[PDB]
Amino acid sequence: SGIVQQQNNLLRAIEAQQHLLQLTVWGIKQLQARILSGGSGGWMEWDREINNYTSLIHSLIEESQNQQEKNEQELLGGSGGSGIVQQQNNLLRAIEAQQHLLQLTVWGIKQLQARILSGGSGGWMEWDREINNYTSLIHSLIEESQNQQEKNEQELLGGSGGSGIVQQQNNLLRAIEAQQHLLQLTVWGIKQLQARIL
Numbered sequence: 019s020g021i022v023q024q025q026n027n028l029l030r031a032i033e034a035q036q037h038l039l040q041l042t043v044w045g046i047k048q049l050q051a052r053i054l055s056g057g058s059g060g061w062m063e064w065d066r067e068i069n070n071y072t073s074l075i076h077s078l079i080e081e082s083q084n085q086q087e088k089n090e091q092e093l094l095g096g097s098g099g100s101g102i103v104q105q106q107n108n109l110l111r112a113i114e115a116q117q118h119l120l121q122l123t124v125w126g127i128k129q130l131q132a133r134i135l136s137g138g139s140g141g142w143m144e145w146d147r148e149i150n151n152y153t154s155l156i157h158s159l160i161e162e163s164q165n166q167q168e169k170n171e172q173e174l175l176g177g178s179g180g181s182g183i184v185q186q187q188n189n190l191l192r193a194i195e196a197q198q199h200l201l202q203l204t205v206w207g208i209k210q211l212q213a214r215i216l
Contacts, residue, residue, distance in 0.1 A: 025089070025187070075119065106187070
């Protein structure tokens, strides 16, 4: 589909990730309250960062929804302008904020696992390697997307037949796909902890 529809799809995917992310945050808090005070070992810092990034991602979603509506109206009118490149900026910032949240949830799961399970049995050793692999992939994808965003905001041909906007859309799609997998990995880890604690 056209770039504006692809951006709609990606925004919807970010919203869906956010719902599940939020469930994971609450799941971790539920587990933590059973087994830890929450007043040592980084947990108050964690609560703060989670709170901030949750606010930030919702604000980014709002900004992206406003731009998406504008872009869809302009498309139906046969215009279109710098709104597509701005929307890639918006979606990249949302992806970055969700990556912070994902990494915070990984930290929380690791603290709980270290407390209430031992070592690498039960699938945990390979979980750790895959978390590190997918986190690695995502950081690479984000950096490339940041570099492409700068290129698109400086170059002249993005809306005149150049490749930069199509390239960037693929970068953002691959980033979200990797983050979908990372979230499935954190869900697995939470479920293992629930089986032990709840």
